[PDB]
Point group: D2
């Protein structure tokens, strides 16, 4: 048999930290993690152990190594139906990728509310805190293909399919609270501008090219979301550490028929955190799967992604109470004006079994709502409602995509629709039309009502002429970008300046850079001048004199728009690199590992080669990777214990390891003679804030390191990084 | 609630004769008829009674009569996701029809062998007389589209999917024992020649046009199957009353590895029976679904179609012992040389629930064989092996067509194939390749053996150069057509002459007619002269002197090639029209109806309007159809009971009903004053064979009518039918 | 007019070195370059300057910035056929990528033989040193998707379509002279092993994972091509500085019917050159389009890729 | 989209306009037209915004919907006048 005698080919079906075990399909890693959707897919899971290899017709194969030929050096024969079926299936494996958000990573989980929301909505999944709704969630980038890298600068999608008892509700959101454009008619133009340019299909996974900034310069409605993308919002550390938003104003409808406007939020219970740009870019080369792998390994470790669902609620009579239009999806609703009510929690606790069958084939669409929710006339939402039904017809092969297992409702579904490519359901109804007598009119319509009723639209009043015209109320483009800019910390603002300066430096036509700097001067002169300086552009006197846009309803900032202004750091699930030497102080290591364990922080033990080293006291320490093999990009903090520091003090790779972690603002902790490394990162004898140092790794040295990790990065180090070459 | 209070909308779930109740889905008409494949479809059967109407996402619908609009006379809104889902599914209901045999009718059933065939084949489904294998059978025409008519002149397909414990085996045959062409490379040429012509797409369901006969005149290999199509074999009475054949020689392989050549047969246990051409052509107009209807209603009545599988077996050492090549599919093996050995019985006993899901999506392919069977080098079979897998990728939408419920095996199937459009199975194997160690190499190959082994091809010797060349052994075209012609009764030979005469009359270019007559003169001079006389063509002295082809292995006829030469008639399931009048002799009708019921012959009571008539003694007689509504075309015989004959004696429809039945050779029985209709059909006072007449329907009147029915038609009447204008 | 007055939006229609001008579609950058295949594509080339914006049915569009709504803050109307055509075409832009070799970069060119090869083959494109055959060439990686990076460690494809006067001949080769496996029946197993693993779809553009090395360790026929892949052959500097091979033995047939066994080679006239691994892996991050860009800009500069 | 295999059905010869048609739509299965436009979006400067919108007018103008007045609530209701 081919597996090793000792069973080391098979991962334990228990939670294990990243790196400890090979990853596995979710039902084999966590067989007793169950939900109603995961149990309903049991009819289509297939196993493998102890079964014979067959054709798809059930014929057992004897030799799966060779084609049928006339003689053993002869021509292959057409009658080889086993070869032809196997190669035909392979030749047809691929389906079209999604037009946007082609790169994504997904998991199963569940949602439960914190209280009944019956007073504001009749949605059944929100009716009782003991109602547990299975979910499937896909996180994604926007521009790149399905084989593009994860840690690009981009908006991220955050789509959740809720399998409710009254239907599937898909909340198809992104990680910023607005979008780039106002009207769905312009979506092909914006997406064509951001995607690879049509002559040569470059660049992949990047907005930093001429056509994107040409469109932005000509369409100032885009500037708000462009500010978010150029911020560190555009480079999240993990899908676990970003916010979600539905963007549009929707409606909640209660059993008395009252409509409330709502915008939806997801708040990450692990907190908000982002990479820095050079780290994100380098990680696209060293691990283009970093966020897919982080999500999968968090769930295999038990560090389940958790989010709180939140609603901003605005009464119908307050529709015109703000100085922006609630229907304009380039405007956000500041939390200082309308707070987020926390409504429930979602936990992602199981990975798929098969990526293609469950993630690639999943179909999310924001028109999939349930009684108790409704739309508004937001003109970007209104066009979305057409596009997701349409695109699924070619991506997933026809109109029966709801029969693909991951998309199936878990509640009953019955109607008079028939046929279509790869129709699975075999209808026995004598009728395929209504009204009918021949089946006593079943399945029957259901009037709307407080529970288990049919869907009726809220009877909004519509009055106007048939026009292709933008509302005048949507014609203000600079106040929300300014509010966002003024809400950032000073280091977040520098990172935004740097994001625009990097991007516009890769625009080849200089007039486009100049037109973007002119737009920036309508938002904030400090930002405009800082970007201009980096491009060698000088503002004109007219530009220096543009009047700043107005505050938003008297606000001149809102700290909820910053990643970092209000502390919300959480270290569970983060990872520290420990740089070993060939004679490690074991007492340093016991102390380190114990304190990390107590906070749920993982460790990775690194050295010069694969294998093991032995500690001063004889403990054998298995090495996970080389310094060069698992770079600092992939960890949150670096600790270097004592022992034979002499042994690594000269290693180019160990030095670079600490230079790169330093440049990227990561906490570094140095014990005993590991303080020799201070010289490579140019740290003064009396120390520096963000470098933890002591004689040994006692319990105090660990608390200080863990406090630095809760604050994510050492922002105060920014003015010091320029003068290490890394 | 729209059903009648009396429950008359719903058919009884019990066997009922044709017309007695509305037809229904098989699992509602016959819920207790079960087999392993029908039970395995339960996971996808969907009911309807008592369920709410929903979208395909499970959202209940309140109003399925209206689109959402801005005001009740306003424009429809794009946000109407319930209208766009319903119309999207409707707009994509169609899939491509099959390239050939697009018109077909299908049913479920089961097969059992009479004894174990373990001495000649290791196929599991033939190993044990107590082993029952579910089947699904589709019967079809060849040329017309899925909306074409059933009783055209054409070859018929007879395809059986056997759901065995060792894999699906599809036996994909037709109703004649040879095909038109020798090498699959010509199949697009032949099928383009018989199909509607490409400029104008005419004619549907007919080979009587110039390109067909141009190809036949240029490719004499076609003449054998053309003879069978021009005979009454081309116009079967029902799928129940035709033979089936696999056409190719295949191999049986036993557990000791011995190969035996085999050709497959189906014998209809209801006997052989065909229409006559004027009746078939007219029936394409009055009921283009006649065979689909007759099949479905026979199964609803309990008149299950039954067939016996038989094998012609030739030892490997006898390959070259005949005047024709066993591998040439334009040659038959006469049963006088190699008898058919009875192997088992197939009963079709349940209709589908949904025609699209089960019939239109079924995929049959003759490359789907099982261990114990193998192919030969027949060059028509060899190209078929390529075509069926290929066509299914576009007809059924991708390479996962085996996951469409009707096509799924009932036995296990596991392999390393993944992905593809509308992938249903979610594989949990950690490996998607072999050899692998990470799942200990499962699923694993299985060596060949006596039972439950892997498939291995028979190690036939191949020797020769790579050539595109027809074997010289295949270059003989006229002997099997002549054997067929000489085996027909004189009335069957007249019907062949009439088939060729009518067909060639529709060929516009007269030189093509003359080239076909010349080919007939190579087969049999009598046939050629009779067709030439009907075409106004005179044979040349050269044609008159062509020497006939040789006998086939000494035979100058083989009666098993005739439909009628050896009586095999069965009356159960046949139907009789009874022509009512407004004061029927109730004693005649009691005697008639119970005689027919005793022999399983159905009746249809006809009159000049719907509703009821009252008999001499007050019995209320319900009318099934009018004389025009249910013409004589649709029945096998006609009975006119006594009573007030003057009610119907001058009814042109009643009179023409008898004239048409008379012309089409059907038995007619006239009781009492119904003998006044003798003048309509010009019968002598002293009577004539084929017309039953007495003073009442008692004594031997019904036995005589039933005797005529068992002989199917009154062939002795053929010379008498010309002196009738009908 | 949205273009700048000075015309600096439009790249010069003449050869210019990398970075000197924005890149452009080839018939705009190099209008004077022609061959028989480029000339035969002219009936489907569509321009743009001075034309009105239309639907695909040729109806001129007045307002391409807004959906049709009932009132300017109202719901979008289903009768907006201009919005639905534009979004429907957008919704259906994608087609499946190639099962293997999905990442690739291509250019037009021409081929000419040095002398007639009629003594060994009757192939018309090889019959006359004056006979010029248009080509279209696509270079590729093997494992990654169409949106993966160029300077991965992988084998590269080198596929040439020759548009001859006796038919299309496709020479579909790679940049090493052997393949990993011996019998096509095993291709899906080998390709499944090298591709991203099926539970989680990682890693992209990399053979450095368990399933690839499990297959290799169990199928020693793979080791030859694995040695090439682990060498600097697996990380070419440019598609211009790698070899090409047809791998298989084919036959040449002359007019007298004689068969000669042949294996096909492409020799880069710019020579052989590879990156080093740390450089290649870092370039996947900093410019995942580096080989597609280098090929396109070499052609816009006149530094045409040449192979023998 | 399903009957004719994708969104380029207007390029099947019988369905093609005989008048000009130019826009920024790209790709799709069996795409025949090879666009040379450097831009595939508007507004653009890189091709001076061509092809360009056309105001409505008496002849050769862009399409504009008649500005019918719409007044009603969002309802799934048959007009009583149709009963
Ligand atoms: C507020 C603005 C929007 C947000 C938050 C949004 C978000 C998303 C997300 C998260 C996905 C990926 C879902 C998945 O993981 O499969 C997606 C896919 C998609 N989006 Fe949107 N989107 C927006 C606007 C639009 C507009 C205006 C259109 C077109 C009118 C559109 C058309 C599509 C299409 C065609 C797909 C691919 C869907 C599929 O193939 O199943 N999006 N969008
Ligand atoms: C002995 C000669 C043949 C017989 C008895 C035969 C019989 C049949 C039958 C009965 C069907 C319909 C199965 C069903 O009901 O779905 C069928 C379909 C078909 N036949 Fe054959 N056939 C013959 C030769 C050929 C040849 C030579 C080719 C091509 C090389 C061919 C290609 C096809 C194709 C493409 C279909 C449609 C299959 C589908 O869409 O699933 N047939 N044939
Ligand atoms: C000597 C070994 C082989 C070489 C040199 C080779 C080379 C290539 C190249 C260069 C391409 C990309 C063509 C392009 O640029 O579009 C390609 C594509 C492909 N190869 Fe091969 N390959 C080999 C073996 C195989 C085998 C054994 C199979 C299957 C039996 C296979 C199936 C494919 C398929 C399905 C495609 C995608 C073609 C398309 O979508 O148009 N290759 N191969």
């Amino acid at each position: 048999s081919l597996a090793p005698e000792d069973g080391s080919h098979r991962p334990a079906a228990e939670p294990t930290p990243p790196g400890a075990q090979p990853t596995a399909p979710g039902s084999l890693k966590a067989p007793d993690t169950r939900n109603e959707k995961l149990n309903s897919l049991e009819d289509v899971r297939k196993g493998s152990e102890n079964y014979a290899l067959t054709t798809n017709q059930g014929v057992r194969i004897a030799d799966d190594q060779n084609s049928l030929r006339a003689g053993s050096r002869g021509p292959t024969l057409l009658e080889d139906f086993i070869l032809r079926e196997k190669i035909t299936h392979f030749d047809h494996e691929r389906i079209p990728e999604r037009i946007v958000h082609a790169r994504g990573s997904a998991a199963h989980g569940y949602f439960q509310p914190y209280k009944s929301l019956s007073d504001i909505t009749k949605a059944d999944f929100l009716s009782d805190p003991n109602k547990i709704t299975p979910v499937f969630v896909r996180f994604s980038t926007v521009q790149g293909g399905a084989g593009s890298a994860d840690t690009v600068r981009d908006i991220r999608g955050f789509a959740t399919k809720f399998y409710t008892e009254e239907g599937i509700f898909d909340l198809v959101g992104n990680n910023t609270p607005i979008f780039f454009i106002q009207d769905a008619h312009k979506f092909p133009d914006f997406v064509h501008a951001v995607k690879p340019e049509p002559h040569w299909a470059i660049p992949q996974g990047q907005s930093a090219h001429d056509t994107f900034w040409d469109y932005v310069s000509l369409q100032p409605e885009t500037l708000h979301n462009v500010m978010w993308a150029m911020s560190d919002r555009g480079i999240p550390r993990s899908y676990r550490t970003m916010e979600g938003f539905g963007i549009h104003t929707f409606r909640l409808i209660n059993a008395e028929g009252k409509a409330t406007f709502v915008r939806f939020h997801w708040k990450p219970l692990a907190g908000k955190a982002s990479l820095v740009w050079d780290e994100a870019q380098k990680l696209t080369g060293r691990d283009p799967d970093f966020h897919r792998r982080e999500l999968w390994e968090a769930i295999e470790a038990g560090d389940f992604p958790e989010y709180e669902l939140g609603f901003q609620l605005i009464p119908e009579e307050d529709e015109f109470k703000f100085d922006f239009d609630l229907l304009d999806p380039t405007k956000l609703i500041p939390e200082e004006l309308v707070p987020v009510q926390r409504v429930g929690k979602m936990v992602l606790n199981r990975n798929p079994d098969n990526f293609f069958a469950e993630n690639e084939q999943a179909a999310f669409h924001p028109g999939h709502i349930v009684p108790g929710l409704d739309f508004t006339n937001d003109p970007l939402l209104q066009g979305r409602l057409f596009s997701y039904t349409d695109t699924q017809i070619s991506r997933l092969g026809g109109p029966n995509f709801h029969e693909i297992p991951i998309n199936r409702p878990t509640c009953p579904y019955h109607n008079f629709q028939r046929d279509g490519m790869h129709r699975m359901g075999i209808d026995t109804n004598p009728a395929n039309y209504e009204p009918n007598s021949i089946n006593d009119n079943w399945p029957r319509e259901t009037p709307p009502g407080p529970k288990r009723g049919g869907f009726e639209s809220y009877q909004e009043r519509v009055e106007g002429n048939k026009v292709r015209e933008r509302s005048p109320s949507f014609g203000e483009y600079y106040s929300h970008p300014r509010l966002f800019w003024l809400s950032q910390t000073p280091f977040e603002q520098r990172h935004i300046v740097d994001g625009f300066s990097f991007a516009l430096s890769k625009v080849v036509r200089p007039y486009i850079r100049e037109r973007v700097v002119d737009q920036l001067a309508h938002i904030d002169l400090t930002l405009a001048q800082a970007v201009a300086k980096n491009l060698g552009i000088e503002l004109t006197d007219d530009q220096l004199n543009i009047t700043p846009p107005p505050d938003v309803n008297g606000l001149k900032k809102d700290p909820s728009l910053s990643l970092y202004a209000i502390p919300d750091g959480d270290v569970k699930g983060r990872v520290v690199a420990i740089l070993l030497n060939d004679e490690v102080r074991s007492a340093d290591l016991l102390a380190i590992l114990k304190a990390l364990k107590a906070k749920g922080v993982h460790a990775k033990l690194l050295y010069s080669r694969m294998g093991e080293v032995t500690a001063d006291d004889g403990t054998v320490l298995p090495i996970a990777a080389t310094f060069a093999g698992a770079p600092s990009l992939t960890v949150d903090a670096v600790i270097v214990p004592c022992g034979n520091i002499a042994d690594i003090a000269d290693n180019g790779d160990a030095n670079y390891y600490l230079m790169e972690a330093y440049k990227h603002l990561k906490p570094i902790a140095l014990a005993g003679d590991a303080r020799k490394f201070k010289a490579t990162i140019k740290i003064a004898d009396q120390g520096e804030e963000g470098i933890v140092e002591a004689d040994s790794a006692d319990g105090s040295f660990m608390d200080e390191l863990l406090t630095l990790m809760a604050a994510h990065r050492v922002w105060s180090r920014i003015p010091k990084i320029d003068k290490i070459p890394a």
